[PDB]
Symmetry: C3
Subunit: 314 residues, 3 copies
């Protein structure tokens, strides 16, 4: 049995729009913890992390809010590793995607052999030097990869970081808005990816088979799934900062997570970029939070074919 540790990460400074810091509140109020308990699940809430304001935080070159972003990830890393040490699956509710730096980092402290599956419209792999936006939620993978050590300058707020994953340890699913520099890195390091082009080519069934085979063929290992909700089409998750049309369907989102759940190796989870303030209507907000919740429940056992307890129902 899956045991769970819920971590709230109400943080927005990895990008411009503020509303994403509310993601944990709105997911919680949607009944997340309750529905989890409704299923197989033993849930422990570690609360929402308290991130002190860092009011003196001028850009580093063009990188924005570097100390605030870096400290928020540091604090998160500590709480993830703690949850992992407590033998629980970590569930991080964001919060912008810059927090993956901390989530993946703390996870890797307890499980250095983790493999990452990254569900997203973006590769989030810009370095502080290749970024044009300066937004750190567009940079988390660059900091985590060993191969890029040599390419990440010393950014204030980030000296605690030590890249914990190799290019071989991550698979992207969903890409459809990749910066040229990101694409250069992607191709140079030979990272496994399934852009929407591949999903279209192969079908989500084969995508997940290749993804799981690629990460677990050699050896079973813990899986960290970093789910940016903008990975799904904005018709399912509109309330988000950087939506891109041509996204994954609701069905595909549920199939990805259904398949991961079934490995029995889900070890860390991030549910990121829900910005309720960005819904053009109250129904767009509910649709977004509802989808986010459903993705999460699938990650912990809720299957479309149904579920039952080990009793005789007749």
């Amino acid at each position: 049995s899956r045991t769970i540790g819920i971590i709230g990460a109400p943080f927005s400074k990895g990008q411009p729009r503020g509303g994403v810091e509310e993601g944990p509140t709105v997911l919680r109020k949607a009944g997340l913890l309750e529905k989890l308990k409704e299923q197989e699940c033993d849930v422990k809430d570690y609360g929402d992390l308290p991130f002190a304001d860092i009011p003196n935080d001028s850009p580093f070159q063009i990188v924005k809010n570097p100390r605030s972003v870096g400290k928020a990830s540091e604090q998160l890393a500590g709480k993830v590793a703690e949850v992992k040490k407590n033998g629980r699956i970590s569930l991080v509710l964001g919060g912008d995607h810059s927090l993956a730096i901390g989530s993946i980092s703390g996870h890797a402290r307890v499980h250095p052999d983790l493999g990452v599956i990254w569900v997203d419209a973006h590769t989030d792999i810009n370095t502080p030097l290749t970024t044009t936006s300066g937004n750190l939620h567009g940079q988390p993978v660059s900091f985590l990869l060993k191969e890029l050590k040599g390419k990440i300058p010393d950014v204030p707020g980030f000296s605690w970081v030590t890249p914990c994953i190799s290019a071989k340890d991550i698979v992207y699913i969903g890409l459809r808005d990749v910066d040229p520099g990101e694409h250069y890195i992607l191709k140079t390091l030979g990272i496994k990816y399934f852009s929407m082009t591949e999903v279209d080519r192969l079908g989500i069934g084969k995508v997940m088979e290749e993804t799981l085979s690629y990460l677990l063929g050699r050896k079973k290992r813990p899986i960290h799934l970093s789910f940016d909700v903008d990975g799904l089409d904005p018709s399912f998750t509109p309330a988000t900062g950087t939506p891109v049309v041509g996204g994954l369907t609701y069905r595909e989102g549920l199939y990805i997570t259904e398949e991961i759940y079934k490995t029995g190796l889900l070890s860390g989870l991030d549910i990121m970029e829900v910005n309720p303030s960005l819904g053009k209507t109250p129904e767009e907000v509910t649709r977004t939070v509802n989808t986010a919740v459903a993705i999460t429940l699938a990650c912990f056992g809720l299957a479309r074919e149904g579920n039952h307890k080990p009793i005789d129902y007749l």
Copy 2:
């Protein structure tokens, strides 16, 4: 050539919302019979069944409107078998899904070797004892299966029933909202199913190939298709009682029926759960009835690649 017998079943007491009893009217007014005649088809309307009110109908334990539901199915069974005896494909317009008890029962009187394909978001396989809702449109399969004889109590209105199909004789397509007890039965009896998980895994092309192979591999036999319109995503069929997101597409709905039509073994058809009263707008109603009509026309020969008469057009 396909010959057709249309049966109206304006009945709602298998579930709480009343508007589904209008389904036959709105489908008819959408031009159903006319469009059928527009294609290959010889159509005979047997009219809308007249279901006397049964005003004394208190719950049986928690099962609601049992006599009304049971009598409505009894009457329907008689009219189906009659249509079948007239050598026609039976086309039942519902009406809530509890009527499948009668539709499948009467069909099986003339063709005891029928195989059932059930298109639906639900398994509709609760027994009177496993149901939590007490709604009979959630129970029709339990009554029909031989394997569950021993598990169905004596419910008033249902003593005429004799289970006519085995677990091996039905394939479900579309499942995404299955009760635990239903899932227990599903797994215990080893019923062939393709939940939305399987459709996602395999693609609808392989789903229909396995479905038709599984039912007809051994021997050709008549096919009964029980189509709950909530099997399709509510973006195509919103005007319905129990909608569930992540449904089959319009395209998939048409591919399922296109493929069935092409077997030349369609023998019975149910078009169920259209509730025009449940459309939030008049366009949602039209979209629902339009989809329902299109599914039906495909079932009787209308193909997306086109159709032509056996003449030289040039």
Copy 3:
């Protein structure tokens, strides 16, 4: 490197609704030429063709505006062949689909071995004799096919025409609204097609593999892609004359064009039937023009996985 020649064809008389003549303006104002230059592309605008009014143009039997349609295609053919002779990929912005007669004709003057891929909800293969609508945008393929020489009467405005393609040289993708006579021709001449039925059966990945194999297996040859925007579902391209539900997705549209681009044999392109006047709202217009632009950019190299210049980004 792809070099491009843009040809505006503001013409509507192949069908009843006038607004399609604006397609070139609205596509241009959406930044088409600029975004092309933003990518690999050397762009030359040949301007919008000026089509003199032909005010005396009574039906030929039931065929409408025959001289106007025929002259507009004649003029277009001249400008395509000119662009082709300048060693550029021709990009025709329509304009109704009747213009394909000229686009394909002029293209074939410089490249008689062209193969055609036709993305559309319709086969547009009615002859002047099989048509029931009399609308010429429903007839362009009949005029182009050698096999139908003998079946096309002498229609005023069309004596300059000489059928340049054989039945073997065209593949249709998307069909879902085919007239009986069209279906007769389709089946009689043995034309390669993937209706929505095939796309559903096979998945777009296999559709494009079979399409490209079928056209290029024997020999590499230039490709002409005639893209009717009604080929995509009206949820992506609503602002159009003859929309049909159950269309290709946005994703499929981009996968088709991504795959064609990658052959490096795209030689001619038509982007047809955008009617901004037919959007029920200003957002429906933008959605339509946006989709049209995106399809086009994919045709000239813009890939979902990303793109980068041949430099070292790190």
